[PDB]
Amino acid sequence: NITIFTRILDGLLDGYDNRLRPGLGERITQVRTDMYVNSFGPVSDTEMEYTIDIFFAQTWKDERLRFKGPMQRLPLNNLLASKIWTPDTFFHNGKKSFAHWMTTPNRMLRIWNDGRVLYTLRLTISAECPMDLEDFPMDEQNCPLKFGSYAYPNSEVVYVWTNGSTKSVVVAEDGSRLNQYHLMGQTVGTENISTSTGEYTIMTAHFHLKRKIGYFVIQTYLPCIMTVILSQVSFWLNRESVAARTVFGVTTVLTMTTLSISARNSLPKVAYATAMDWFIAVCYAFVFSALLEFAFVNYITKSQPARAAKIDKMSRIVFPILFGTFNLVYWATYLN
Amino acid sequence: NITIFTRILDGLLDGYDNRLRPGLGERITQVRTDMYVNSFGPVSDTEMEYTIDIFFAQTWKDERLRFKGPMQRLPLNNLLASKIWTPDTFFHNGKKSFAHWMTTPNRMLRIWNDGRVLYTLRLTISAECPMDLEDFPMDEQNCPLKFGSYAYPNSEVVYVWTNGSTKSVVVAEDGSRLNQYHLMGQTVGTENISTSTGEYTIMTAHFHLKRKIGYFVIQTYLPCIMTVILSQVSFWLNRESVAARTVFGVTTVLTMTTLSISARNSLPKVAYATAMDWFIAVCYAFVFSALLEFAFVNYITKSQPARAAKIDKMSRIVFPILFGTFNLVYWATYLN
Amino acid sequence: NITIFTRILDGLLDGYDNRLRPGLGERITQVRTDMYVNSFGPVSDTEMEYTIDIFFAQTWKDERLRFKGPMQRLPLNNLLASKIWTPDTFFHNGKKSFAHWMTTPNRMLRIWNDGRVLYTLRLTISAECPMDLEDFPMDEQNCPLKFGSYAYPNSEVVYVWTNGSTKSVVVAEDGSRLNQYHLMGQTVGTENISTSTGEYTIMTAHFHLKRKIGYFVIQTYLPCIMTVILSQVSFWLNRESVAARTVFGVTTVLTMTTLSISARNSLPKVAYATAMDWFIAVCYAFVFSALLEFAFVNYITKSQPARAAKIDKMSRIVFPILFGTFNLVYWATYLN
Amino acid sequence: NITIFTRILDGLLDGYDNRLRPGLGERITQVRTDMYVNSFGPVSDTEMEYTIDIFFAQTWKDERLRFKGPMQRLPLNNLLASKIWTPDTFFHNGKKSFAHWMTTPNRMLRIWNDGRVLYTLRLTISAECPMDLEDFPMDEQNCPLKFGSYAYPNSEVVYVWTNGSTKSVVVAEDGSRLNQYHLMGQTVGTENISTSTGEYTIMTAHFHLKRKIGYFVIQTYLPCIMTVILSQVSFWLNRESVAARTVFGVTTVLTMTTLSISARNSLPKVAYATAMDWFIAVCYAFVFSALLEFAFVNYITKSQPARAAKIDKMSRIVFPILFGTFNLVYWATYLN
Amino acid sequence: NITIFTRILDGLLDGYDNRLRPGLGERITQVRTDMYVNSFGPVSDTEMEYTIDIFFAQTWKDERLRFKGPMQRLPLNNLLASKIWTPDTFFHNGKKSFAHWMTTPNRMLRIWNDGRVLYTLRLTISAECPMDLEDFPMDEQNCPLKFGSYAYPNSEVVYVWTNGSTKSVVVAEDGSRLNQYHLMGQTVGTENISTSTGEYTIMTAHFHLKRKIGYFVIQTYLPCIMTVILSQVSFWLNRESVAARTVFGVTTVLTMTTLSISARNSLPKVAYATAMDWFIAVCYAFVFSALLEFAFVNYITKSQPARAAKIDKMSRIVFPILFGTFNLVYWATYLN
Ligand SMILES: *[C@@H]1O[C@H](CO)[C@@H](O)[C@H](O)[C@H]1NC(C)=O
Ligand SMILES: *[C@@H]1O[C@H](CO)[C@@H](O)[C@H](O)[C@H]1NC(C)=O
Ligand SMILES: *[C@@H]1O[C@H](CO)[C@@H](O)[C@H](O)[C@H]1NC(C)=O
Ligand SMILES: *[C@@H]1O[C@H](CO)[C@@H](O)[C@H](O)[C@H]1NC(C)=O
Ligand SMILES: *[C@@H]1O[C@H](CO)[C@@H](O)[C@H](O)[C@H]1NC(C)=O
């Protein structure tokens, strides 16, 4: 009762050429793609890439595989995958894609009487995600995933998402777990590209990432915030205490300087200014300006002590308000 | 007397198809899994994953392999592994699983007269272990290990642990050696998951990890503890010594600041506060507040020196008690 | 109607030897190469190399593959690639070249009735790009890409770019995206090299890279600029304030020192001076010289106070002008 | 005269099954192992592992390979290695073992008339070496190397070292070169282990490593030694010089603090105290205590100046002696 | 006219056994080796290894390959490489050697009528280069490259360099480009080694490397040089300025301390002192001694001010001369 299955498989491969796509010279082969994200791996900002584990699935029609038997489906494994024609799908932005072979090559092959074929494949893709860090860290990144045929133009093989966008891409609840990103949602798109070798259909899946703030708050913003507050303490010290107020300005300015370098060490070496950089510069100005106020006051503490005292007392109030006022504009500007 | 063995093996493979699971269309194939952990590799907190070396073993019944002979068992190696059907077991959370091929592919295959099959396989899994670092470092992590069929639904192939939980998972005494973790114990669990391709049985093994404290004590807590004590020394200095007390506050605050950044460098970039972070903040407040006390005292040392002296003398006692009182609440809160 | 295709392929391979190049002993095999850069990967300055993803394409004539049929072209995949002769092309400067095999080996094979063959191959090359960092960061780097035959001398196999330079190399608009480089343009070149085994033709593709400045401005130049300004503040302080002015000179000089080490940490360990290094040295001299002025003034503040005061007042003006004057010469010298 | 060799090899493989161990069902197969260490690779303390390059050799008896001919030996290469049965030897603690295939798979196969077989194989093992860093750096580590059969229990295959321990393991004079370790010697051991699948013989080779001190002396101890001496200089300064002595204590304490963190950065994240840590703590106490002495003296310099001066003068002598006395106990305690 | 080539190749393989070396049992096989270094890769000092890309070539005589035909040579590729016997050459010190397979395995095979064979192979070797850093950085390193047979003793296979040393090893002009090394020249050597398995011939190629100084000058020496000069400035300050001179000594000593740690971070963890370390120690003594002079002077500024002033004035001259005098001895000692 099992030998029946074996005979059918031999018949299907009898006179079957895997080098020829189904329906060659008769029509255009249609392929349906559905993606299930097993886990959305970490996003390496420095390398401008991300890791993803998916169960990539394809469906298409092959008349040569039509069969009649008691069983309407033929679940199988990688053993028969190489014996028949499969599309030469590849990822344009996939820099290094390697499948999993342990314990067994994770491949599923199913066939129905009508000749429909289902070929689900597991993959891990280190695809690149270019990002415009103009509003970093309050940025919404759109990491795409582009794949298509390598040798079959749009006139021979066509890729189309199955059903709607919701069913086309499925993300596991526990899979979408990142340390510094929120997976807001997913979208799909298709387009044609003309090249030297002809037109090729392209399937693009976009993942909307909303960076979660709070790590940099504990890392960069707070030290800058407290650093500015530390410098303003010098305004409460006597003018004649030249040495004491000198340390406050010198130490704070250097403290801000090292934070600027340290903060960008983890950040990618992008040749443009981010929102964080502007925030650092403002904090640098406050501490730097505070030092100037002391130096200017100390310079005129002899000729006109009266005005010098007014500046010191006035300074204690002006700077905290300006720093507080700036923050509301800053955070409100980006958090909206 | 050895040729007898060779003839039997040829007979078993005579007319045997490895593309068809045993008992197809007659019943549901039952698989028993037992795991022996050769060594529990290091846990990379930054990468939120861990390494494990195990002798994964599976057992199932195949009537096609029934044989009669003087020997009741047929120990073998990887040579015959690929010649017969094996389950397409894979690890859902296994990000990169690679077997060991040196000196020889570590695979064992045994067969009995009844047709029972034993297939033990060695593997090294870089599986991911998501962790909720709300109580870090005093946290108990539950790193799971999920595996199941990739192409055979729950209606065809079923995985079940053999005997009880104790015998199902075995850990070598010397294997469970980690630098910053205690292997409290192991547990097993099974569940069904419904997907587009059908229901699949899932086997989950949970390892209970109790992080061992003491590395961070020598790394983060003690420098913070001594740093707070260092700042309080300024309370024992004369008020007029403005420059001397100034250095204590400035240096200590920056010292705490750098520790906060340095401490999280090894810690993963998680977007939420840990218990250690709260401890750092409190230590920051003490040193920061100590500076305020000196600044406030130095500001009113002219108008009302009497009250200023009282604050200084009172400060020497209040702060150490508060810091000592806080620690008892802190450690007792988490160590319980 | 499909079997016709299968018969033709069998006929082509009937009596076809892939170990013999086409037109052997009759003429010289001519190969046309066209390159399409899918994406210009990051350039690792420390490793003096770069990553590139290209669709390398070759064209040549093979009389043995002449065929007659209804279809004038035979699109195919990697399956037939190994069945026929192909050139042993390799990259001389390619340190580690690995192709992409997922989902399928990205290879295209096309044949026409005349016998023309097109063999496009995807590759990722970690080629080395030697750079002369004499004008770093204002440098224009010319990263080449050299490839040629490994076993067929120039007398047997010849590589020539197809059409002009513009069509020979094509770069995708989104592919040429780097963090700290501008892809100004591309060029091609060919040359013969004589070795022990004979003459071999060489095909060289040069990419002109214009480093984009601005990352180092926020990283190195600005801290140096503000550091120099910070030191000059000591010139506005009273001479008798020995301790206060002492901190300015000491802290600034060390600040410059650490920047010099930190700046070169990311830079490759090149045994020669860059333009940035000279800029750092000048900034070091200003801060260092400022300390000398205070020390010299403090030494003669007793014997001849009159001249000491003149130097201090004069110093406040001389140094800022010299630093400002130097920058115009510096930036203008390289930005031209 | 060469064809004679070819005929014999064909005869040996005629009717030879590599899936059956020699002497099956007649006796227990005996295997002799001899190891020649080509080079003892570096030991990664952080990863708790080491690299080793060896020419692993095995010897056993196979009656099926008995032959008669003019030549008493048959030197060969990897070509015939896969054609005959070989043991499934594997390394229990080998985390990632990969052989060398360039230029050719480094395998030797020799056969004599009696049927004795010699199978030498080159390997590189990233085996793990657990270490008890209780006396670090003055520690003697015993890195083992365990290997045995994966599928053949102790009742079928037995591993035994050949001759004595000296001949069993051979280390090249230039191979045993490490940056921070001395290869004192080697030893061998055998034991039986009972598991679920049966008893398996185990062969263990232990390498005695005596860590060479001197790198940490220039890295950790000396900075601590000079740091303590630097703090004691404050004892030679006048009491009224509050600011000057303040810097000594503050800077030295922070200097010790950063050394503690920096020292353990290279050290593995072990959750227990090492000998170096205790040495650091003592040095921390001296600098910390020195600050207390100044603070205590400065506090009572008004009420009882006489006793304050005695403490300062006495302090200059007590602390250096205690630090010197402690070192003799420390180094002598571990260097014995 | 092409079929003639195909027939000859079939005849050569007709009755040809690749498991038997040529001239077996008749003479000793002689192999000539010539090396062409495509590029001398970077030398990783920390890992004590280097990367090299070479076109390794071998030549030997095989009577079985004698043929007669119109063409006197048979250029080929990797296709026929595995069909015939080749030596089992391996690199003793090669830790990880991997060939290049893209676009095609870079292998050339040529045969002449007499039976001479040429087999050029491309390789990339991460060989280890032990170094004695006694005179670092002014050191001349001799990185070797050892290779030989793995299974054929010296009595069967012999390796000999072809012609003289100049022709034996060839280095491309642009290939020998390193960041911190000069390729002074190359040499070859041969020797016999006796082991358990017999005598094996060894071929050794030595590369003479002259480290280029200048990177450490900008990294370590200059900061130390300026640091010493900075400390000596305190000698020009008034004795009563206790606080000011205190900062100079404290900051400079710590600055030297951090440089010592930072300098060795890139340097390998060698357990012995280098020339740079001695230079650092001397610079440490100057800054450390300068602090002692101030402390000693400040201690006796009351009892005998006259002698204290003499020391200060004398100190300003003695220390710069000693530091200048030391450098001439230092650099001249190693630069000769
Ligand atoms: C691509 O080409 C096909 C040709 O049938 C067309 O139907 C489709 O709309 C095109 N897609 C785009 C995005 O232009
Ligand atoms: C999974 O399905 C099987 C069907 O027989 C059932 O017996 C089992 O209880 C199910 N497991 C769970 C966890 O629901
Ligand atoms: C290389 O040799 C060929 C021989 O035909 C010649 O035509 C060509 O000009 C040569 N190229 C160069 C750069 O000399
Ligand atoms: C292991 O078992 C064998 C059985 O023959 C015995 O001879 C040997 O002594 C045992 N080894 C140990 C260490 O117990
Ligand atoms: C190695 O042995 C051969 C034996 O013929 C001898 O000719 C050669 O000189 C020996 N080489 C050395 C370095 O001793």
Numbering used by the authors:
A (entry chain E), B (entry chain A), C (entry chain D), D (entry chain B), E (entry chain C): 14 to 322, 393 to 419
The publication says:
α5 subunit-containing γ-aminobutyric acid type A (GABAA) receptors represent a promising drug target for neurological and neuropsychiatric disorders. γ-Aminobutyric acid type A (GABAA) receptors belong to the pentameric ligand-gated ion channel superfamily (pLGIC), and in response to the neurotransmitter GABA open an intrinsic ion channel that permits the passage of chloride ions and drives inhibitory neurotransmission in the mammalian central nervous system. Instead, here we performed rational engineering to generate high-yielding, high-stability, simplified homomeric and heteromeric constructs based around the α5 subunit that could be structurally resolved by X-ray crystallography or cryo-EM.
Comparison of an α5V3-apo structure solved to 3.24 Å resolution in the absence of ligand versus the α–γ site in wild-type αβγ receptors reveal close similarity (RMSD peptide Cα backbone α5V3-apo versus α1β3γ2 apo or DZP-bound: 0.85 Å or 0.75 Å, respectively). In terms of global receptor conformation even though α5V3 lacks β-subunits to bind GABA and initiate gating, α5V3-apo is more similar to the αβγ GABA-bound state than the αβγ inhibited state (RMSD peptide Cα backbone α5V3-apo versus α1β3γ2 GABA-bound or inhibited: 1.66 Å or 2.4 Å, respectively). Consistent with this the α5V3 ECD matches the ‘twisted’ ECD conformation of GABA-bound αβγ receptors and the M2 helices lining the pore are retracted such that the hydrophobic leucine activation gate (at what is dubbed the 9′ ring) is open. Although theoretically wide enough to permit the passage of Cl− ions (Pauling radius of 1.8 Å), the hydrophobic nature of the −2′ ring of Ala side chain methyls is expected to prohibit permeation, although other studies propose that such a gate could be partially open. α5V3 is not expected to gate in response to orthosteric agonists of αβγ receptors as it does not contain GABA-binding β-subunits, so we performed whole-cell patch clamp recordings from HEK cells expressing α5V3 and tested agonists known to bind directly to the TMD and induce channel opening. α5V3 did not elicit any response to 30-μM doses of propofol, etifoxine, etomidate, pentobarbitone or allopregnanolone, nor indeed diazepam (n = 6).
